[PDB]
Design a protein. Structure first.
Length: 405
C-alpha cells in the first residue's frame, strides 16, 4: 500500500490529473517516507508513456550513490511491472522498453568529471534529481538547460538542509515562478512503517537533525553541533573491560594537533578507551611521521594484536599512511564525509552506539566548543567551524567508517 501522497507522485503527470499542466515536481521531506522509490518509478512510467526514442537524465550526489539509492531497486520494481531494462554499466545509461516504446535514461553525478562533459551537449526530454539538496547548483541549472524537448518535466527529490540553501531559496520559495508541484513528505506517508518502527527512528535523532530528517523542516544549523552530548549519559568510568575488537582513529597534524583514539567493542557498544593528543604549538616542538608511528605503537602496546583491526586515518596524511604500511600496520582510509559524518556521530550518541571513558578530557572539551559556521550557514552552506575539532574529527572518521556503511 502506497499512501494517498505516494499515489499523487505516481499520477500527477497523467492527463486525467488537475495538476498535469505543471512543468515538474519537488518532493522534499523526511527520510524513509517512501518518496525516492515511488518518484523514481513514476519518472520512468511518465517518460515511457509520454515519449518514444527520447533521452532522459537521472542524477545523484555521485553515480554510485544514485545506483545504490535509486536505480537498483527501481530496476527490480520496473521488471516486476513488466518493463524490459538493459543497464549499460560502463556507459552509465539504461534502455527501458515498454509496450512497443523505448527510451534512454542517462545516469549523472553532481560533481562527477565525466558527467560534466556529457551534460554540456546532450538533449533531454526530462531530468530527475535525487538528493538535489546535496548537488551543486551550477550542475542542476546546466542539467535543466539541456531539457530542450517539447513537453519536458523536471523532477526533484531531497531531504532538508538550511532555509538559506539555494534549493530552498530558488526552487521551493519560487515555486509558482518555475511552475512546479510540491509534495512534502513525513514518515506518516509511508504505510509500510509500523508505529513500532517509526518510534525507533524518532529516537535516533535530536536537535537540528531531528527537525530536518523527521519533521521534514528546512531549519537553520546554529550553535553547538553535538547538542545531544551529555556527560550524565555518554561518559563512563575508566576501568578495564574485556574488549572484543579494537581500532585506532587518527586526525593527523604536524602544525596542528595530532590525535589517536583507542576504540574497543564490548557488548554492542564501542568505547573510546583512551585518547592521545599532541600539540605542536603548545609543546613548542613539532613531530615527524616516525615519531607519531613510534607513539602509535606505545599507544597500543597493551592490546592483543589478534583483536586490533587497524588504524583509521584521513587519506590526506599519505606520508604517514606510507610509513604505517611499510611497518605492516593495517590502514583504513576514513570516510571523510563532513556533514554526513557529523550527522552519524550524533546518531551514535543518541542511540548510545558509543560511550567515552572519563579520561577522554580533550575530547569532552571539544564537544562543548564544536559549533556550526554561522556566517556560512546563512549563505546556505552547513559547515563546522574547523577549530578544536581534532578529537571530534577522529571520532567522526571512526563512527562514519566502522559503525555506518
Amino acid at each position: 500500500p502506497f499512501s494517498k501522497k505516494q499515489l499523487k507522485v505516481l499520477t500527477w503527470w497523467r492527463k486525467a490529473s488537475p495538476v498535469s499542466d505543471k512543468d515538474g515536481i519537488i518532493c522534499d521531506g523526511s527520510i524513509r517516507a517512501g518518496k525516492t522509490i515511488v518518484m523514481s518509478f513514476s519518472y520512468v512510467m511518465w517518460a515511457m508513456d509520454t515519449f518514444n526514442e527520447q533521452n532522459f537524465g537521472m542524477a545523484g550526489k555521485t553515480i554510485g550513490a544514485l545506483r545504490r539509492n535509486v536505480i537498483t531497486p527501481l530496476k527490480r520494481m520496473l521488471k516486476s511491472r513488466g518493463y524490459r531494462v538493459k543497464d549499460h554499466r560502463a556507459d552509465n545509461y539504461l534502455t527501458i522498453t515498454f509496450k512497443g516504446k523505448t527510451n534512454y535514461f542517462y545516469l549523472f553525478g553532481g560533481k562527477d568529471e565525466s558527467s560534466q562533459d556529457l551534460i554540456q551537449g546532450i538533449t533531454l526530454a526530462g531530468m530527475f534529481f535525487d538528493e538535489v539538496a546535496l548537488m551543486p547548483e551550477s550542475f542542476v541549472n546546466q542539467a535543466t538547460a539541456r531539457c530542450s524537448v517539447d513537453g519536458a518535466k523536471l523532477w526533484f527529490n531531497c531531504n532538508p538542509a538550511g532555509p538559506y540553501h539555494w534549493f530552498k531559496v530558488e526552487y521551493l520559495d519560487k515555486l509558482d515562478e518555475k511552475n512546479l508541484l510540491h509534495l512534502h513528505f513525513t514518515m506518516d506517508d509511508n504505510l509500510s512503517l509500523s508505529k513500532q518502527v517509526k518510534e525507533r527512528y524518532q529516537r535516533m535523532y535530536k536537535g537540528v537533525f531531528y527537525q530536518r530528517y523527521i519533521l521534514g523542516l528546512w531549519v537553520l544549523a546554529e550553535g553547538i553541533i553535538y547538542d545531544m552530548f551529555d556527560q550524565d549519559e555518554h561518559v563512563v568510568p575508566t576501568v578495564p573491560r574485556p574488549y572484543e575488537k579494537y581500532y585506532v582513529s587518527c586526525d593527523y597534524g604536524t602544525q596542528n594537533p595530532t590525535t589517536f583514539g583507542l576504540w574497543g567493542l564490548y557488548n554492542g557498544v564501542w568505547y573510546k578507551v583512551k585518547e592521545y593528543h599532541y600539540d605542536g604549538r603548545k609543546e613548542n616542538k613539532q613531530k615527524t611521521d616516525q615519531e607519531y608511528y613510534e607513539d602509535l605503537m606505545k599507544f597500543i602496546e597493551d592490546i592483543e594484536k589478534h583483536k586490533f583491526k587497524g588504524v583509521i586515518v584521513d587519506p590526506s596524511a599519505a606520508s604517514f599512511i606510507a610509513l604505517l604500511r611499510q611497518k605492516g600496520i593495517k590502514v583504513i582510509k576514513a570516510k571523510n564525509d563532513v556533514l554526513d559524518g557529523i550527522r552519524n556521530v550524533a546518531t551514535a550518541l543518541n542511540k548510545k552506539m558509543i560511550l567515552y571513558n572519563d579520561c577522554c578530557k580533550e575530547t569532552f572539551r571539544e564537544y562543548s566548543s564544536y559549533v556550526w559556521d554561522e556566517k556560512a550557514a546563512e549563505r546556505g552552506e552547513d559547515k563546522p567551524v574547523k577549530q578544536n575539532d581534532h578529537q571530534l574529527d577522529a571520532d567522526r572518521y571512526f563512527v562514519n567508517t566502522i559503525l555506518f556503511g
